[PDB]
Amino acid sequence: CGVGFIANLRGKPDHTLVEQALKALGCMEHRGGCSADNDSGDGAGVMTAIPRELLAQWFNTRNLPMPDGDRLGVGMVFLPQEPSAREVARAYVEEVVRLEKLTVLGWREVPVNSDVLGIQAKNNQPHIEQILVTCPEGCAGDELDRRLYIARSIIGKKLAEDFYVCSFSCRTIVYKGMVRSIILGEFYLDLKNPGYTSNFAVYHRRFSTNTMPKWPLAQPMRLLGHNGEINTLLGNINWMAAREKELEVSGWTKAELEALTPIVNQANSDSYNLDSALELLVRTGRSPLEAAMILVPEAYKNQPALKDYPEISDFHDYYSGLQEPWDGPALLVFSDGKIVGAGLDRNGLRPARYCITKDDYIVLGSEAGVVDLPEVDIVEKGRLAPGQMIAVDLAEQKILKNYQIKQQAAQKYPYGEWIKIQDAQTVLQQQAAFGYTAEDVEMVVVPMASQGKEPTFCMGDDTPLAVLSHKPRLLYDYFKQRFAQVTNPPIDPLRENLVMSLAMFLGKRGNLLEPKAEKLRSPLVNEVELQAIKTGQLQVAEVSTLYDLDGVNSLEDALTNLVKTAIATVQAGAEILVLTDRPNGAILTENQSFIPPLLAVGAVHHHLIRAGLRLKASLIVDTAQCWSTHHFACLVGYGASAICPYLALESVRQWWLDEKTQKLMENGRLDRIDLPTALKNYRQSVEAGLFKILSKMGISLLASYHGAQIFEAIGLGAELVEYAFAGTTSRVGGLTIADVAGEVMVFHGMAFPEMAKKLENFGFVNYRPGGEYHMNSPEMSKSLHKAVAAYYDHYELYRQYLKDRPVTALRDLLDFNADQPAISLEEVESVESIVKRFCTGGMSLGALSREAHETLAIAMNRLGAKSNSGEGGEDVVRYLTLDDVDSEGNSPTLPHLHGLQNGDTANSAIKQIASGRFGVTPEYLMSGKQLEIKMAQGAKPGEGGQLPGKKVSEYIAMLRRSKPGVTLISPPPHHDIYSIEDLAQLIYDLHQINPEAQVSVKLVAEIGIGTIAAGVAKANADIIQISGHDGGTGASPLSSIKHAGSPWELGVTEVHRVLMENQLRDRVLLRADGGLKTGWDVVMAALMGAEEYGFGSIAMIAEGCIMARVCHTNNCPVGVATQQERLRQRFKGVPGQVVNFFYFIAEEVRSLLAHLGYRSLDDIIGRTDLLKVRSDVQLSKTQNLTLDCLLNLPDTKQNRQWLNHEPVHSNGPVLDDDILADPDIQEAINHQTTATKTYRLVNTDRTVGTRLSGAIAKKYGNNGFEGNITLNFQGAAGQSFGAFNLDGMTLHLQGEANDYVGKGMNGGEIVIVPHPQASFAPEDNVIIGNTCLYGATGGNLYANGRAGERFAVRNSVGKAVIEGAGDHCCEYMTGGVIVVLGPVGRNVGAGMTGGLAYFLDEVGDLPEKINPEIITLQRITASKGEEQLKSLITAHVEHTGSPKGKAILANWSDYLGKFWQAVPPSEKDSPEANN
């Protein structure tokens, strides 16, 4: 979406504003979507004041007296087209408008031209009329709106696509529609009438993820335009909706509150809900600014910019207790009519530029150069940093973030006033009972306890799902974490922790609406915090999570009573309920059985909501059965406000208090571990894991994660879910309350009846004979390895093990159901033809040895399929076909590979763009048939790539242009894609640089993917890939391998269905992967919707992986996942083996096509109707699964056209196309020419100069060019200005630019300069957006102006001078030189790992702001430092003329003093930070 406002303070309403408002929506067009029409838009809208002049003519014609401005009041109404129904509708409006003592002067029909709508939108178009109203008592502004608010909310109970009130006020009005942006005024004629005039205007261009427009969903709402995604929606709604009965305020009546009855609702969009909630806060006596701060509060902690403002620190501390944040990225834009303004999500994930004149004429919006003021008169040119609002007030005043927040700091204050004032070894079998296992403690509790970080592992989740396994499992295991993919970003929990919190509030949440004067650091609480708390504010009835045996028979009863006990106890005054499994002291064999802590905490939490009582108390779960990071997050997820994991804490006590352990600590394990540390490590590890999990979804506060239920269950059933976990999806439906009972029995049996010596080991993490099954055993793989190596008996073995297995994934419950006669292999398409559909899938060069990696590329190239470069860059040497190959199978260009032919190439068909941008270079991008945006990977969705330092050889360091020793943890988000439009932009950058390349977007299966893919389709992508949780990794958290992401059967299916329903299916190719190792696997993926099929681990195995499982170690005994030369030498494995492997899989595909009866995989894809549920299978845990989700897909027997895709989507006529169209092809082809050109830019002009860069890149790679093409530009530049700039390319910006300047820049220069006619201070005024220089790789950027956040985010070699910045300055920087000449927001060094930066922060406040995890603040001390800093600060001036530049430069000897230099422990010893 795009958004803004325009305000005029010092004038009376004019038309120009309206005019400008509309022009501005024009420039939002790329931030918006269109329907299947390619024409109707996802929405476009405009809020203004009442065009009291225009309405004047209605009154005249009717011979009627026009009421006072404060007393007129106007409904913009969408009504049924059908006459009879439109009168029923009209009669209702009036029925209720009359029910508040109001009077209807009548209706105005709204002049429209339906002829410009696109066929879809026109088909759907409601009939639009404005109702004009008054109060005979004499009501006014506030009171009238108050009544009108009540009115619209009542009419809202009948809301329908045909029947919706867009706005009903005496102050503002909304014209909005399913039109494309510049069509708005074309459609609504009122907006092109010179009688239309307003002081302000909010505008909004929407971007939806479907193709079926609903007029109400267009969007400036009744009160705000909202651009973003509430990632916490379910929680926020659930809390908000429990407030609903006890609403209570100043003289608002109890029946007037019961009138807004449901002020929020799961079925509406985050935005309709936000607007609603925000509305309620305003109508009950707060200004839009304040209420925003209540619901979408800043991150206030550690903010040195609130030194002088302890008011607002306190007014957040207060509310932080009352109301959880509506998280997710968000630019809000609102007007009361009285006030109008904008503010950002806590994290500042959307752009927001403002512009101000001498006459306080203000202009905010997602983009800089949009409403065209006369620059000679701009006074400020600002932006909102994360948290900031900016506002206007009718009494002619702008209002910057600070006065602002102070103004509700001043009032209702009590802030910092009312705040202040507020022994055996039974353990070894308790442990069994509560479900502990040999591995749970050895592999998880211990590592947390000893190293203080949850364990790391490799490879994918090999074993079957909880509901299909035969081994016992917790209830926790049935819940997979959901995470952010395109729709919204993850945040970095380590680099950006400063923004989060695990605080939790034990008080009962009172009244939001009344600020009356009348707290857990972390959710984990020790036996100490627990004693402490059980004193606390209130007493705290234990409810037995326990129950006896026989007679009071089932877990069904025990649950029931617990709820009743719980309900009953809360009624009787209890403000905290510790649910224990340890009531009155002890756990027995007669206390025979538990309510699993997750199942209880859901029950009491939902049942209480149904009781209308949750806001009353708050929940502590006091349990044994909770030790693992995930465990904790289920709990907080479904209710728990805090956890005392009394047994986990206990299992650490016993471990450290043990001879074996105590002994090793004297030599072997770290005897730097007093029991106080072993425990302080155990929790500090639990905390880092919570932080992590939240971040996977972009969530800052456990307070927000709390109600919200950020999971998708798999194998829970219909009633089980409704009872305990209401509103969580389980599209597969298994476990009954009985069945969960039966499971807890399975390991209740084994601590009690029997005997206790060591908890059992079930091969969960690591293959074992006795234990859980694994698709990839060291044995299956040696047998497959020897099979490929020949050219049989190993397939016997090999397939054998693959028969031998139980159910493992959902495709196993399925089977074929042919609909045509069997056929002969000889009719079927050839092995050669199928093999083109295969992909080897993208494992990084770091992760794998170059031997292993280059080999896959060769076999894949041979088959005419594709392999994939992972996130590691690619060695340039690879882009060349081999001649040097000789008789022995060796070749000088790649001396470490074997069995090469002479047509061979090791260049990767697919080239990956991941969050770290590691190799991402103009020629990189250009050697590449396809380009992949890695949104996420199956082993670890919310997270980002991970490369232990051990593995960063110099080679890897060279390829990644990063530092030899140093660990590489890439950022969770791409700093580039904070939203769907953002995605759309990156695709366009890519199509822009290599128009020839297809662009894929790689997602992980999880509920919601279908909706995301719809958007990706609309964002012009060429291929979507669905990865399952199955997938492999060279290193991930173990919790993640076992807990994040759903199965690809759910992914592909959903993507396939939603795209078909949305009519986008033809737009896009579907690649599926995750645990595919077999013809049958491919066929199942095909039936399910996939057209291409990916293989990681088996390609690996086929090259010689055993399944050691030590990838993260650098030890592959076998040369595959190491960088160690010794081990690499052991690499057996030749392209021919991976070639032959793929030919097997193919062959097996041909035979399946034969039993099914079709000639070609093309004929099969999507024919889900060829699947039936299998006759043999029975599970151990439940009677069956529901498989509607896999079987009910769109018929595909006839409609097969979606299977024909255009070769490559295009960016359209683009400015670069003209540039590349004159006398330039000379400066290029004659390797050495100068060329100057000059052009006007408007901010539709995106990615400028990038395609020229590609054109040069393609002919002389990164460095072959000695030309001097200069392109000077003027105006406001679009996203990605100068991206991937080469040497020999210089770009001039007379003007300003937007986000991502110099994204990917490789070489050359970019110079940006306000326009001379400015009269403002450059250094004091913004000139560039967020994420400039992103993964810069060389080149130089100079800019007189501030820049926004993440300046030089992942800079590897780029140099720059700017004059101020937002937060996250130099975020994951790694090399190069950044010079900043003005203030700079906080977190200034997060994970920066090499390179030098020099600030100059004269408020002197810099070290309070800096991130201290790694970089060090020095004062320039070494001369060559000076010399480095000068020539830069000088260059800037020679390219620019900077005033602050020239200043320092002539008083070189003064500013140079306190003026800090940032040194990563790595440039520590270099001629510029030492001597």
Ligand SMILES: Cc1cc2nc3c(=O)[nH]c(=O)nc-3n(C[C@H](O)[C@H](O)[C@H](O)COP(=O)(O)O)c2cc1C
């Ligand atoms: C050792 C290893 C390293 C991987 N590295 C990456 C990575 O660099 N980027 C990425 O998108 N996927 C990576 N993957 C996942 C693959 O892209 C692919 O999706 C996955 O291997 C398919 O699952 P499968 O192993 O079951 O066949 C890696 C997988 C493994 C086995």
Ligand code: F3S
């Ligand atoms: S499991 Fe990994 S540790 Fe080596 S054996 Fe396979 S590459």
